[PDB]
Design a protein around this ligand. Structure first.
Ligand SMILES: C=CCC/N=C1/NN=C(c2ccc(Cl)cc2)CS1
Ligand SMILES: [Ca+2]
Ligand SMILES: [Ca+2]
Ligand SMILES: [Zn+2]
Ligand SMILES: [Zn+2]
Length: 158
């Protein structure tokens, strides 16, 4: 159950996807980070360049970590548990159709899921939990973290 020992973590988006605009990738990521923040003592800070705790990046197939992606659909993305270097980072499959809508796949919802993994959360068995193993769309505007998930970060940190 490793968790971060620091509450203010930094993050960095190393690249984007031609699908959405640049300000649509950041907003998606920005908000995905807020969800966990309003349910924990964690504060996330963004940085343009430099070393950051959670590295965000879009990759295809082999991207140097023994966990290749698989092209359209299937494995939408993945993240690492709290730790150094790679620990905490999140990588998204670049061969996916990233949208802002209800269309597969909503970047916000997926990011919100991986970030749960970076902070130390595991999968849930509640079909309504954000941390549920499989994807599912849910209204994103005015979207808030599911109680099971709230019990999640709350159980690790505070
Ligand atoms: C859609 C959801 C993807 N969610 C996952 N999250 N991250 C996973 C992972 C575990 C270990 C290592 Cl080394 C890399 C990545 C398991 S799949
Ligand atoms: Ca895939
Ligand atoms: Ca890291
Ligand atoms: Zn990876
Ligand atoms: Zn997962």
């Amino acid at each position: 159950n490793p968790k971060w020992e620091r509450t203010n973590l930094t993050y960095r988006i190393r690249n984007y996807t031609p699908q959405l605009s640049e300000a649509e990738v950041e907003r998606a990521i920005k908000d995905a980070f807020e969800l966990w923040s309003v349910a924990s003592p964690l504060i996330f800070t963004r940085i343009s360049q430099g070393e950051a705790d959670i590295n965000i990046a879009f990759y295809q197939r082999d991207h140097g970590d023994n966990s290749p992606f698989d092209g359209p659909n299937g494995i939408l993305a993945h993240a690492f548990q709290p730790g150094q270097g790679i620990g905490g980072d999140a990588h998204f499959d670049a061969e996916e159709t990233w949208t802002n809508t209800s269309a597969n796949y909503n970047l916000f919802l997926v990011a919100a899921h991986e970030f749960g993994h970076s902070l130390g959360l595991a999968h849930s068995s509640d079909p309504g939990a954000l941390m549920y193993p499989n994807y599912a769309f849910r209204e994103t505007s005015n979207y808030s973290l599911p109680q099971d998930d709230i019990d999640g970060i709350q159980a690790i940190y505070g």
